[PDB]
Amino acid sequence: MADKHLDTALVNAGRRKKYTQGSVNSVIQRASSLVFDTVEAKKHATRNRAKGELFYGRRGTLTHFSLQEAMCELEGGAGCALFPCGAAAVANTILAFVEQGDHVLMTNTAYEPSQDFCTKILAKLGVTTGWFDPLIGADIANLIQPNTKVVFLESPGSITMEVHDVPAIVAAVRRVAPEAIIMIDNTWAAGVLFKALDFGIDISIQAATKYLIGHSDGMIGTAVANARCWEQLCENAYLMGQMIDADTAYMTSRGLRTLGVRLRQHHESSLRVAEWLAQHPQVARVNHPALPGSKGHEFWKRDFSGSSGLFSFVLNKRLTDAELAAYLDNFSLFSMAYSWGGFESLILANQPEHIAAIRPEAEVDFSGTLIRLHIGLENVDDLLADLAAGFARIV
Amino acid sequence: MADKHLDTALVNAGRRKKYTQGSVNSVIQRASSLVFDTVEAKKHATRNRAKGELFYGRRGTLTHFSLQEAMCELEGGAGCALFPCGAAAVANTILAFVEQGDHVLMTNTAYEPSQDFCTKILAKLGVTTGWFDPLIGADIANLIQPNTKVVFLESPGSITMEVHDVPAIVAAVRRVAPEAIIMIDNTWAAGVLFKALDFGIDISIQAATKYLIGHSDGMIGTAVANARCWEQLCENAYLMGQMIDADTAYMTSRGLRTLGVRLRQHHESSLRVAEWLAQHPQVARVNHPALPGSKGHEFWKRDFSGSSGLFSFVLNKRLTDAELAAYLDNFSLFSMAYSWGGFESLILANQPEHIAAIRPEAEVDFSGTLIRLHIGLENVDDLLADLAAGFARIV
Amino acid sequence: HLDTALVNAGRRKKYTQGSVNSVIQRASSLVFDTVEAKKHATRNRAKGELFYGRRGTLTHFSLQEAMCELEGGAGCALFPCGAAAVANTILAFVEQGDHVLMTNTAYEPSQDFCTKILAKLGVTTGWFDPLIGADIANLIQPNTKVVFLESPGSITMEVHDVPAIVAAVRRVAPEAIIMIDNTWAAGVLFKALDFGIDISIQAATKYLIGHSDGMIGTAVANARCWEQLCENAYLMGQMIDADTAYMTSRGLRTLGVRLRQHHESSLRVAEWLAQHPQVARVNHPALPGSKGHEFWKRDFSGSSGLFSFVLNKRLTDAELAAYLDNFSLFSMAYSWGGFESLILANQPEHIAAIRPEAEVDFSGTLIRLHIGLENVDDLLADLAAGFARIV
Amino acid sequence: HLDTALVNAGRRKKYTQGSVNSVIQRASSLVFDTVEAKKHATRNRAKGELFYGRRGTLTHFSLQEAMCELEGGAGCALFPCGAAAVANTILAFVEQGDHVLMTNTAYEPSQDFCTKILAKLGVTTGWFDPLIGADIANLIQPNTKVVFLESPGSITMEVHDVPAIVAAVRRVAPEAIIMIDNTWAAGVLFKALDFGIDISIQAATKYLIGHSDGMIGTAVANARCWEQLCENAYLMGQMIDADTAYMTSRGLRTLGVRLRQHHESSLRVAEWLAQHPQVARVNHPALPGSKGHEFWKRDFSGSSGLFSFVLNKRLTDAELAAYLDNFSLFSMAYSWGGFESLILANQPEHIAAIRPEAEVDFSGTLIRLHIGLENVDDLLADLAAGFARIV
Ligand SMILES: Cc1ncc(COP(=O)(O)O)c(CNC(=O)C(=O)O)c1O
Ligand SMILES: Cc1ncc(COP(=O)(O)O)c(CNC(=O)C(=O)O)c1O
Ligand SMILES: Cc1ncc(COP(=O)(O)O)c(CNC(=O)C(=O)O)c1O
Ligand SMILES: Cc1ncc(COP(=O)(O)O)c(CNC(=O)C(=O)O)c1O
């Protein structure tokens, strides 16, 4: 990504004359009803209603088709399904491939809403879920059951940032259960720093809410599938009514155009911050995929073409409630909020016992408060000064 | 509705200073991340994350909260869940209340995507679906099984327009299965011409895509629940990631403001067209809830406060493929498209055997082509002239 | 029929591309595939070929076509708001040494453009009473270039006798540019160009947008005046954004149903006020006895919802607050044309100050109402509660 | 630091209401709860209190604060596009009998506003070479009111010596209004007001929007000039819609990262072109030897991506088509400032026609490039393929 290999593709993806009609960007076609001039046109649209002919707004307008083409090009897929947000993409992509009696095997570092979908929705529909440590690698083979239908990856993991050995996991799954559907939540890589479908994963899911939108002001999920899995994903998600509005689709395409320049800055700035934290006396551990020594760093170095700006670190103590407020309430530049992927730097704390509660069948291996940072586009020296002032409030 | 009882409420619904901030309409707050100024604010927002405190964009921003308040006021509910479209609202509202082993009882005149969700998604998750004639009334009692969890109504029915006797259905359900969840797709009434929750229905679902948006350019679903069912609907829909974007929420609130004036014109114009069709030698039957003699008209007259503009009629013959094109391809004012509820008049044909295929366990009682009209805001004499020219093409 | 025309205006496949409404094409840069395509676009840069976003995109072209159809014009120029349309449409037709005649009931920003901008640029403005009719001929000077009408007038609602004014202007100065601010009629209740007016200007902000949430001006010109309007407004950089253009087209579709309700409700309110013991006068074009009512009935095809009335006394400051601060449905705000009912007050001397070279003929406090889409009986109850606070 | 300021500019809780970005408040009417609130809003109608949508809503106020911070001004007026900002900012400060001095490299619509609009309103315009520096003093007349700069110049990219120009103006006419079209620098690579310029104008359409899909003008004035700019632009009805204001604020947030890439890529392309046998001259402010390069290096903190070069021959019409019609990555279009690379050609006489009272000093065909965000080696390959089509 630092060699800027993808910048031309990002500028051009999805932009064909039939969508752009003379402008640089696609038109925004807001529609439910899509008009058929003739019965013959209606027949053709019906036959091709999932193949990019205008049929009905739930299937998409020109604006959606342009984004779908862009996502398929950038992630190397056969089709791209769109959803109201990342969590809708995760829940509905899993649901599209399960039936009563099936089993899902999910990394224990999966985003908490993804886990809760499995334990609170799937379980009562007769679909069981089991868990694996993110560094399990080839030893995942022993956890695959005869009814395992879906293997769900997330690399780096949520909050704690562990990087999977995807080649080892995929090879083991294909040896034991070649027909399984392997999915990944590939949001941290923005789908482009880790080419999931080139690794033999079947479906790459993103919260496009994060880096694709890139400005903290739009929510949208995507799922890019290979040819084997596309039709089932497309049609079963459609039966759940999943779609995104045309305007957000436009804004997602628009975010792609600056994604390379943004990601390079997030990488540079966040790694500098991580390197400083890693030498700091008030820091016990830094979890940054690009930082040597972080969990799965060797796999990040081998398998990814760059880093984004989200990472975490563990303080040298667990902050009490009072210390947590003294720390978090008084930052000048970092904002406290959920989500990430924008221009604004963000800070979010989790206590060790909070993380343990969202690591099913596992324990945490740290005792300090875990601080997750999203490093935005501000000057990195200003961000470091803000972090230093925070440390002085809790020293 | 013709007495304009609701016009003031429609103008004012959801408009409180905290949402409007000095303007007439609510602000549009586009957000994923929502910032917590302090740990105390984060705690309060977390506790109240489903109760209208800013927490995270998936739960909503000020713009969503304003629409939700408006919908609860207008439909008399405890809460309103928002979805990417009507079909998402139907599928996810049903899903929110079922588990493996349950049974759904659905009118055989339900919108086809609603039926297909049941037969193609629910069945493989261990949830069975049975069917009932829309005029079954009190005799629905005999179809309720010990595992019937959901009774799903749609009045008027899709395409064929049959009106249920909701009081008789509800009373029978409550006598046999008082805990059942009774739902209705109340799109044709725009949630306001039929006050479903006052009839003892638990959840009123709409494709807000239709009359609430009112302009054929925005897609959104709503589900307004009573206090008994709200928390389950809210939390289970949230686990599926269901939401709508802030801009569409704004446009839905904005559509409410003209809904009364629009519906009165749709009623006037469509009933005039229906009355003319009912005397026409090339028409076998008119299906309009407001037309005396139409199926369930007596229930429409008793239970509804007005009509919208969607209805259908049966031609005196089945048009061949060639005649269908001669008829439909040459209208000057009616456009051929799916959906309805806008300012534009629309025409859509279904052959009798097409309808039979979407009437599970039932047959049709007509043999001519079924023409569905959405009567928009054009001058009714111009619409009549367009229909007359169409008749001359097939006489 | 107007309702059918409103639904269909501007909607051609090259703009709608399969949807009911036009696409929204957001653009500055518009791409030319070849040198020849660039030459063709340049030739057609004001004629609906994509050239540069300042001229417009498909979305603008669709709105412009709609406005030309509905108002019977050769072209429609777009502006950021109504005040920009007024100021720039007048400016487009004047130069040092010219004279503008303007009704003394013109919207106050229109007047202030003339006195604060035009005068120092060598363009003089004279004033006339809105009921002058044929006697305007006596005010036409050798250098009169523009005659600027506004019917009904701002706030006080006087309706011109447009046929008499136009005939008198054409007898003296047939080449003069006659303009009207036709906002109250939404350009459709009064077909200005059919009366021989050259340019019909609107604050599309009002009833065309219809929801109090978008600002835009329009000016529809006949064939004689279009090229000068188009090019001189373009030299001032005047345009509207594509999204507001889309919303204006969208507003047209419900304009008929909305206006009929505004007419029905506002005439009922006016008739009730006229009977009320605390009301001295009602200024509503549709109310019998109102100034120029006979021209409204003859020349218009309906009414909108904006009008005013004069109280039977001059409110003190305490009474003004007791009255205005405690309404339940009417909101105090500027503008009008939306679904929300609005109220504003003016003392007589406030109006006299914006009636150049004239005095007012009333002494009570003037109340301007915009009658929105609420139930009229609820609005009447709100007005009655207001009367009780000041009786 | 600029990057931190860009991320944070204009973002205060009263505009953001809990989100990262400002709310979008779409409004004409703004409601007053009481008479007192209306009086307060009226007093503060240009000072960030909600009064009427033509003045702005929260969304506009947030952008205005951001622009004032970033450009170091007392106020920021908003306009429908850059050309509207130029025309209306000049118009705000002139009257019959005044004189404008303008660089002969000004954007052509700016010149045409002066010759086609101002002249007939009694305001004369004289011209100067962009490298005139201190010798501009000899052109200042007793009636010179405005001095209008554009650095770098349009198309040909000449950089003024702003310190020398400003000092010379202030020696003769210290009260003159010095304005600059600061679009190329995005208002942030050249801190115009810190140099003693009174008003910095931008086509925010370019790098502030940054995506070729939104049009808007800005003008940031010092304390001495703000009230006249604000009020006179308002009398012309100048405003931008709330949504475009939001998108402009949003564009600011990535402006630093974008500009650094445009600088890196465009300087690499310029350096390569300068070595190329088919290139006579490169006009890039950052390239050594370019006109006024020493002032760019001294006075600016970076470069953007727009520049031009002169071919070693005058292309025939056939060669122009062979060259321009067959690019794979560069698009032919007007405007610039986005992620897309753009190309346009001008013959020398086309430029001479827009250099008033001057001739050009080249005879080859001039090519203007906007260098976008594509990989620079891909752009170089596209340029090389173009050279091969005309060698
Ligand atoms: C890896 C991942 N996958 C999916 C989602 C859900 O995406 P949506 O919020 O539904 O668009 C998120 C959201 N993350 C957050 O809010 C947070 O980490 O604080 C995510 O991190
Ligand atoms: C009664 C009803 N319920 C739900 C929906 C789905 O709503 P969405 O399209 O997903 O927003 C529709 C849509 N109707 C159509 O398109 C049509 O009848 O042609 C409907 O009629
Ligand atoms: C007749 C007329 N012409 C033009 C405009 C200006 O339109 P813009 O506000 O610039 O879009 C208005 C606005 N009216 C108001 O605000 C008000 O009467 O309180 C108007 O009444
Ligand atoms: C220096 C400068 N100043 C103002 C404007 C006008 O800005 P607007 O187009 O009205 O927003 C432009 C536009 N440039 C172009 O289109 C082009 O160079 O091809 C400009 O370069």
JSON list of N, CA, C and O and ligand atoms in Angstrom, two decimals, chain A residues 84-88 90 111 114 154 158 185 187-188 206-210 219-221 310 337-340 348 372, chain B residues 32 56 58, ligand 1:
[
{"chain": "A", "resi": 84, "resn": "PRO", "atom": "N", "xyz": [-27.46, -2.53, 5.67]},
{"chain": "A", "resi": 84, "resn": "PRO", "atom": "CA", "xyz": [-27.57, -1.23, 6.37]},
{"chain": "A", "resi": 84, "resn": "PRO", "atom": "C", "xyz": [-26.40, -0.89, 7.24]},
{"chain": "A", "resi": 84, "resn": "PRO", "atom": "O", "xyz": [-26.21, 0.29, 7.54]},
{"chain": "A", "resi": 85, "resn": "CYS", "atom": "N", "xyz": [-25.60, -1.86, 7.67]},
{"chain": "A", "resi": 85, "resn": "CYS", "atom": "CA", "xyz": [-24.43, -1.59, 8.50]},
{"chain": "A", "resi": 85, "resn": "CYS", "atom": "C", "xyz": [-23.59, -2.86, 8.53]},
{"chain": "A", "resi": 85, "resn": "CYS", "atom": "O", "xyz": [-24.00, -3.91, 8.03]},
{"chain": "A", "resi": 86, "resn": "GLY", "atom": "N", "xyz": [-22.40, -2.74, 9.12]},
{"chain": "A", "resi": 86, "resn": "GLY", "atom": "CA", "xyz": [-21.54, -3.90, 9.29]},
{"chain": "A", "resi": 86, "resn": "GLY", "atom": "C", "xyz": [-22.18, -5.04, 10.06]},
{"chain": "A", "resi": 86, "resn": "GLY", "atom": "O", "xyz": [-22.06, -6.20, 9.67]},
{"chain": "A", "resi": 87, "resn": "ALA", "atom": "N", "xyz": [-22.87, -4.74, 11.16]},
{"chain": "A", "resi": 87, "resn": "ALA", "atom": "CA", "xyz": [-23.44, -5.83, 11.94]},
{"chain": "A", "resi": 87, "resn": "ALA", "atom": "C", "xyz": [-24.54, -6.54, 11.16]},
{"chain": "A", "resi": 87, "resn": "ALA", "atom": "O", "xyz": [-24.71, -7.75, 11.31]},
{"chain": "A", "resi": 88, "resn": "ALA", "atom": "N", "xyz": [-25.28, -5.81, 10.33]},
{"chain": "A", "resi": 88, "resn": "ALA", "atom": "CA", "xyz": [-26.26, -6.45, 9.47]},
{"chain": "A", "resi": 88, "resn": "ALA", "atom": "C", "xyz": [-25.60, -7.35, 8.44]},
{"chain": "A", "resi": 88, "resn": "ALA", "atom": "O", "xyz": [-26.12, -8.43, 8.12]},
{"chain": "A", "resi": 90, "resn": "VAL", "atom": "N", "xyz": [-22.69, -8.95, 8.83]},
{"chain": "A", "resi": 90, "resn": "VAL", "atom": "CA", "xyz": [-22.22, -10.15, 9.51]},
{"chain": "A", "resi": 90, "resn": "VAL", "atom": "C", "xyz": [-23.39, -11.09, 9.79]},
{"chain": "A", "resi": 90, "resn": "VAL", "atom": "O", "xyz": [-23.35, -12.27, 9.44]},
{"chain": "A", "resi": 111, "resn": "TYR", "atom": "N", "xyz": [-15.83, -9.57, 16.88]},
{"chain": "A", "resi": 111, "resn": "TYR", "atom": "CA", "xyz": [-16.61, -8.43, 17.32]},
{"chain": "A", "resi": 111, "resn": "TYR", "atom": "C", "xyz": [-17.81, -8.89, 18.16]},
{"chain": "A", "resi": 111, "resn": "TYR", "atom": "O", "xyz": [-18.53, -9.83, 17.79]},
{"chain": "A", "resi": 114, "resn": "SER", "atom": "N", "xyz": [-21.17, -9.73, 16.69]},
{"chain": "A", "resi": 114, "resn": "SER", "atom": "CA", "xyz": [-21.16, -10.94, 15.88]},
{"chain": "A", "resi": 114, "resn": "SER", "atom": "C", "xyz": [-21.35, -12.17, 16.77]},
{"chain": "A", "resi": 114, "resn": "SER", "atom": "O", "xyz": [-22.10, -13.10, 16.43]},
{"chain": "A", "resi": 154, "resn": "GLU", "atom": "N", "xyz": [-11.75, -13.38, 11.94]},
{"chain": "A", "resi": 154, "resn": "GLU", "atom": "CA", "xyz": [-11.67, -11.92, 12.07]},
{"chain": "A", "resi": 154, "resn": "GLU", "atom": "C", "xyz": [-10.22, -11.60, 12.39]},
{"chain": "A", "resi": 154, "resn": "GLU", "atom": "O", "xyz": [-9.73, -11.94, 13.48]},
{"chain": "A", "resi": 158, "resn": "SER", "atom": "N", "xyz": [-11.02, -8.19, 17.08]},
{"chain": "A", "resi": 158, "resn": "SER", "atom": "CA", "xyz": [-11.57, -6.98, 17.68]},
{"chain": "A", "resi": 158, "resn": "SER", "atom": "C", "xyz": [-10.86, -6.65, 18.99]},
{"chain": "A", "resi": 158, "resn": "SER", "atom": "O", "xyz": [-10.66, -7.53, 19.83]},
{"chain": "A", "resi": 185, "resn": "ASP", "atom": "N", "xyz": [-14.45, -11.25, 8.73]},
{"chain": "A", "resi": 185, "resn": "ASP", "atom": "CA", "xyz": [-14.71, -9.82, 8.93]},
{"chain": "A", "resi": 185, "resn": "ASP", "atom": "C", "xyz": [-13.38, -9.10, 8.70]},
{"chain": "A", "resi": 185, "resn": "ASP", "atom": "O", "xyz": [-12.46, -9.16, 9.53]},
{"chain": "A", "resi": 187, "resn": "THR", "atom": "N", "xyz": [-12.82, -5.85, 8.03]},
{"chain": "A", "resi": 187, "resn": "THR", "atom": "CA", "xyz": [-12.99, -4.41, 8.18]},
{"chain": "A", "resi": 187, "resn": "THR", "atom": "C", "xyz": [-11.67, -3.69, 8.46]},
{"chain": "A", "resi": 187, "resn": "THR", "atom": "O", "xyz": [-11.41, -2.61, 7.92]},
{"chain": "A", "resi": 188, "resn": "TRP", "atom": "N", "xyz": [-10.81, -4.24, 9.32]},
{"chain": "A", "resi": 188, "resn": "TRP", "atom": "CA", "xyz": [-9.60, -3.51, 9.71]},
{"chain": "A", "resi": 188, "resn": "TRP", "atom": "C", "xyz": [-8.71, -3.25, 8.51]},
{"chain": "A", "resi": 188, "resn": "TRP", "atom": "O", "xyz": [-8.08, -2.19, 8.42]},
{"chain": "A", "resi": 206, "resn": "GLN", "atom": "N", "xyz": [-17.30, -6.55, 5.33]},
{"chain": "A", "resi": 206, "resn": "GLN", "atom": "CA", "xyz": [-16.82, -5.33, 5.95]},
{"chain": "A", "resi": 206, "resn": "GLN", "atom": "C", "xyz": [-17.94, -4.50, 6.55]},
{"chain": "A", "resi": 206, "resn": "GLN", "atom": "O", "xyz": [-19.03, -4.39, 5.98]},
{"chain": "A", "resi": 207, "resn": "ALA", "atom": "N", "xyz": [-17.60, -3.86, 7.65]},
{"chain": "A", "resi": 207, "resn": "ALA", "atom": "CA", "xyz": [-18.33, -2.65, 8.07]},
{"chain": "A", "resi": 207, "resn": "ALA", "atom": "C", "xyz": [-17.73, -1.51, 7.25]},
{"chain": "A", "resi": 207, "resn": "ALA", "atom": "O", "xyz": [-16.70, -0.93, 7.61]},
{"chain": "A", "resi": 208, "resn": "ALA", "atom": "N", "xyz": [-18.36, -1.22, 6.10]},
{"chain": "A", "resi": 208, "resn": "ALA", "atom": "CA", "xyz": [-17.92, -0.11, 5.26]},
{"chain": "A", "resi": 208, "resn": "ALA", "atom": "C", "xyz": [-18.05, 1.22, 5.99]},
{"chain": "A", "resi": 208, "resn": "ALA", "atom": "O", "xyz": [-17.36, 2.18, 5.64]},
{"chain": "A", "resi": 209, "resn": "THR", "atom": "N", "xyz": [-18.85, 1.24, 7.05]},
{"chain": "A", "resi": 209, "resn": "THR", "atom": "CA", "xyz": [-18.90, 2.27, 8.08]},
{"chain": "A", "resi": 209, "resn": "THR", "atom": "C", "xyz": [-17.54, 2.82, 8.49]},
{"chain": "A", "resi": 209, "resn": "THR", "atom": "O", "xyz": [-17.42, 4.00, 8.85]},
{"chain": "A", "resi": 210, "resn": "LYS", "atom": "N", "xyz": [-16.52, 1.96, 8.51]},
{"chain": "A", "resi": 210, "resn": "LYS", "atom": "CA", "xyz": [-15.19, 2.31, 8.98]},
{"chain": "A", "resi": 210, "resn": "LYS", "atom": "C", "xyz": [-14.42, 3.03, 7.88]},
{"chain": "A", "resi": 210, "resn": "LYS", "atom": "O", "xyz": [-14.76, 4.15, 7.51]},
{"chain": "A", "resi": 219, "resn": "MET", "atom": "N", "xyz": [-23.24, 4.69, 7.62]},
{"chain": "A", "resi": 219, "resn": "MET", "atom": "CA", "xyz": [-23.20, 3.29, 8.04]},
{"chain": "A", "resi": 219, "resn": "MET", "atom": "C", "xyz": [-23.65, 2.40, 6.89]},
{"chain": "A", "resi": 219, "resn": "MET", "atom": "O", "xyz": [-24.62, 2.72, 6.20]},
{"chain": "A", "resi": 220, "resn": "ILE", "atom": "N", "xyz": [-22.95, 1.28, 6.71]},
{"chain": "A", "resi": 220, "resn": "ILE", "atom": "CA", "xyz": [-23.16, 0.40, 5.56]},
{"chain": "A", "resi": 220, "resn": "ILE", "atom": "C", "xyz": [-22.30, -0.83, 5.75]},
{"chain": "A", "resi": 220, "resn": "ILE", "atom": "O", "xyz": [-21.16, -0.74, 6.22]},
{"chain": "A", "resi": 221, "resn": "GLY", "atom": "N", "xyz": [-22.85, -1.99, 5.42]},
{"chain": "A", "resi": 221, "resn": "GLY", "atom": "CA", "xyz": [-22.08, -3.22, 5.37]},
{"chain": "A", "resi": 221, "resn": "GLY", "atom": "C", "xyz": [-21.98, -3.76, 3.96]},
{"chain": "A", "resi": 221, "resn": "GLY", "atom": "O", "xyz": [-22.87, -3.55, 3.13]},
{"chain": "A", "resi": 310, "resn": "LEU", "atom": "N", "xyz": [-6.02, 1.45, 13.62]},
{"chain": "A", "resi": 310, "resn": "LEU", "atom": "CA", "xyz": [-6.64, 0.99, 14.85]},
{"chain": "A", "resi": 310, "resn": "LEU", "atom": "C", "xyz": [-5.74, -0.01, 15.57]},
{"chain": "A", "resi": 310, "resn": "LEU", "atom": "O", "xyz": [-5.30, -0.98, 14.96]},
{"chain": "A", "resi": 337, "resn": "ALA", "atom": "N", "xyz": [-15.55, 7.49, 21.76]},
{"chain": "A", "resi": 337, "resn": "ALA", "atom": "CA", "xyz": [-16.70, 7.05, 20.98]},
{"chain": "A", "resi": 337, "resn": "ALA", "atom": "C", "xyz": [-16.46, 5.62, 20.53]},
{"chain": "A", "resi": 337, "resn": "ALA", "atom": "O", "xyz": [-15.32, 5.16, 20.49]},
{"chain": "A", "resi": 338, "resn": "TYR", "atom": "N", "xyz": [-17.53, 4.94, 20.13]},
{"chain": "A", "resi": 338, "resn": "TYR", "atom": "CA", "xyz": [-17.44, 3.68, 19.43]},
{"chain": "A", "resi": 338, "resn": "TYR", "atom": "C", "xyz": [-17.12, 3.91, 17.96]},
{"chain": "A", "resi": 338, "resn": "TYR", "atom": "O", "xyz": [-17.15, 5.04, 17.46]},
{"chain": "A", "resi": 339, "resn": "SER", "atom": "N", "xyz": [-16.85, 2.82, 17.25]},
{"chain": "A", "resi": 339, "resn": "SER", "atom": "CA", "xyz": [-16.48, 2.87, 15.83]},
{"chain": "A", "resi": 339, "resn": "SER", "atom": "C", "xyz": [-15.09, 3.48, 15.65]},
{"chain": "A", "resi": 339, "resn": "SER", "atom": "O", "xyz": [-14.39, 3.76, 16.62]},
{"chain": "A", "resi": 340, "resn": "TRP", "atom": "N", "xyz": [-14.67, 3.63, 14.39]},
{"chain": "A", "resi": 340, "resn": "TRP", "atom": "CA", "xyz": [-13.31, 3.95, 14.01]},
{"chain": "A", "resi": 340, "resn": "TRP", "atom": "C", "xyz": [-13.27, 4.03, 12.50]},
{"chain": "A", "resi": 340, "resn": "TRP", "atom": "O", "xyz": [-14.29, 3.82, 11.83]},
{"chain": "A", "resi": 348, "resn": "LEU", "atom": "N", "xyz": [-11.01, 4.49, 23.50]},
{"chain": "A", "resi": 348, "resn": "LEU", "atom": "CA", "xyz": [-12.06, 3.69, 24.10]},
{"chain": "A", "resi": 348, "resn": "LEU", "atom": "C", "xyz": [-11.40, 2.70, 25.05]},
{"chain": "A", "resi": 348, "resn": "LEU", "atom": "O", "xyz": [-10.46, 2.01, 24.66]},
{"chain": "A", "resi": 372, "resn": "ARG", "atom": "N", "xyz": [-7.99, 1.19, 23.54]},
{"chain": "A", "resi": 372, "resn": "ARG", "atom": "CA", "xyz": [-8.00, 1.08, 22.09]},
{"chain": "A", "resi": 372, "resn": "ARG", "atom": "C", "xyz": [-7.95, 2.48, 21.49]},
{"chain": "A", "resi": 372, "resn": "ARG", "atom": "O", "xyz": [-8.75, 3.34, 21.86]},
{"chain": "B", "resi": 32, "resn": "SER", "atom": "N", "xyz": [-21.90, 7.44, 12.67]},
{"chain": "B", "resi": 32, "resn": "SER", "atom": "CA", "xyz": [-21.66, 6.17, 13.33]},
{"chain": "B", "resi": 32, "resn": "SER", "atom": "C", "xyz": [-21.20, 6.48, 14.76]},
{"chain": "B", "resi": 32, "resn": "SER", "atom": "O", "xyz": [-22.00, 6.42, 15.71]},
{"chain": "B", "resi": 56, "resn": "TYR", "atom": "N", "xyz": [-24.74, 5.20, 19.84]},
{"chain": "B", "resi": 56, "resn": "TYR", "atom": "CA", "xyz": [-24.01, 4.72, 18.68]},
{"chain": "B", "resi": 56, "resn": "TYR", "atom": "C", "xyz": [-24.96, 4.77, 17.49]},
{"chain": "B", "resi": 56, "resn": "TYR", "atom": "O", "xyz": [-26.15, 4.52, 17.64]},
{"chain": "B", "resi": 58, "resn": "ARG", "atom": "N", "xyz": [-25.78, 2.92, 15.11]},
{"chain": "B", "resi": 58, "resn": "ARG", "atom": "CA", "xyz": [-26.65, 1.75, 14.82]},
{"chain": "B", "resi": 58, "resn": "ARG", "atom": "C", "xyz": [-27.93, 1.82, 15.66]},
{"chain": "B", "resi": 58, "resn": "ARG", "atom": "O", "xyz": [-28.95, 1.31, 15.20]},
{"chain": "E", "resi": 1, "resn": "LIG", "atom": "C1", "xyz": [-14.71, -5.50, 13.11]},
{"chain": "E", "resi": 1, "resn": "LIG", "atom": "C2", "xyz": [-16.09, -4.89, 13.10]},
{"chain": "E", "resi": 1, "resn": "LIG", "atom": "N1", "xyz": [-17.06, -5.49, 12.42]},
{"chain": "E", "resi": 1, "resn": "LIG", "atom": "C3", "xyz": [-18.31, -4.98, 12.39]},
{"chain": "E", "resi": 1, "resn": "LIG", "atom": "C4", "xyz": [-18.66, -3.82, 13.03]},
{"chain": "E", "resi": 1, "resn": "LIG", "atom": "C5", "xyz": [-20.08, -3.35, 12.98]},
{"chain": "E", "resi": 1, "resn": "LIG", "atom": "O1", "xyz": [-20.24, -2.31, 11.98]},
{"chain": "E", "resi": 1, "resn": "LIG", "atom": "P1", "xyz": [-21.53, -1.33, 12.10]},
{"chain": "E", "resi": 1, "resn": "LIG", "atom": "O2", "xyz": [-21.31, -0.46, 13.31]},
{"chain": "E", "resi": 1, "resn": "LIG", "atom": "O3", "xyz": [-22.75, -2.22, 12.29]},
{"chain": "E", "resi": 1, "resn": "LIG", "atom": "O4", "xyz": [-21.51, -0.63, 10.76]},
{"chain": "E", "resi": 1, "resn": "LIG", "atom": "C6", "xyz": [-17.67, -3.16, 13.76]},
{"chain": "E", "resi": 1, "resn": "LIG", "atom": "C7", "xyz": [-17.99, -1.92, 14.49]},
{"chain": "E", "resi": 1, "resn": "LIG", "atom": "N2", "xyz": [-17.15, -1.47, 15.37]},
{"chain": "E", "resi": 1, "resn": "LIG", "atom": "C8", "xyz": [-17.37, -0.62, 16.39]},
{"chain": "E", "resi": 1, "resn": "LIG", "atom": "O5", "xyz": [-18.38, 0.09, 16.47]},
{"chain": "E", "resi": 1, "resn": "LIG", "atom": "C9", "xyz": [-16.27, -0.58, 17.46]},
{"chain": "E", "resi": 1, "resn": "LIG", "atom": "O6", "xyz": [-15.34, -1.37, 17.29]},
{"chain": "E", "resi": 1, "resn": "LIG", "atom": "O7", "xyz": [-16.40, 0.23, 18.36]},
{"chain": "E", "resi": 1, "resn": "LIG", "atom": "C10", "xyz": [-16.36, -3.71, 13.81]},
{"chain": "E", "resi": 1, "resn": "LIG", "atom": "O8", "xyz": [-15.37, -3.13, 14.50]}
]
